[PDB]
């Protein structure tokens, strides 16, 4: 629901959503975007 959106808000008003009470499998994050910059800082993306 955050990658299927159609009106991703402009940067001046950055839409902030909270994710809790859920199981995060980032394969569904991988399949919805042919990535261009997956630069991760706090955590290695593979170890997610």
């Amino acid at each position: 629901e955050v990658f299927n959106a159609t009106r991703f808000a402009s940067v001046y008003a950055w839409n902030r959503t909270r994710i809790s009470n859920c199981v995060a499998d980032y394969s569904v994050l991988y399949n919805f975007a042919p990535f261009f910059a997956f630069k991760c800082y706090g955590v290695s993306p593979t170890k997610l």
């Binding site: 399949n31 042919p34 990535f35 261009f36 910059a37 997956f38 630069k39 991760c40 593979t46």
Partner: protein, 97 residues
């Protein structure tokens, strides 16, 4: 010109401009992860010069390739020449579309 190297590897490949800055030890991108990953403690140099006279012509040219879909990341200094249809969802699909 005043060092001695047990051995020297020269990997050559033409690639788009942004990927030139992409190519570096410890980076990310469709090339740095699925096409060519440079190991972290790399000891050497990278060389990039513009070649629009050998990779271009009227009516176009599409001889060059790259891999934007791989099952996993590419380990440092490994080649993954393969044409396997990437799996999306759960289909054993073997085809395009």
């Amino acid at each position: 010109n005043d060092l001695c190297f047990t051995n020297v590897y020269a990997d050559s490949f033409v690639i788009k401009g942004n990927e030139v800055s992409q190519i570096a030890p410890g980076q990310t991108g469709n090339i740095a992860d699925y096409n060519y990953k440079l190991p972290d403690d790399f000891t050497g140099c990278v060389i990039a010069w513009n070649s629009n006279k050998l990779d271009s012509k009227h009516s176009g040219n599409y001889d060059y390739w790259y891999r934007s879909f791989r099952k996993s990341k590419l380990k440092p200094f490994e080649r993954d020449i393969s044409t396997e249809i990437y799996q999306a969802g759960n289909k054993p699909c073997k085809g395009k579309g």
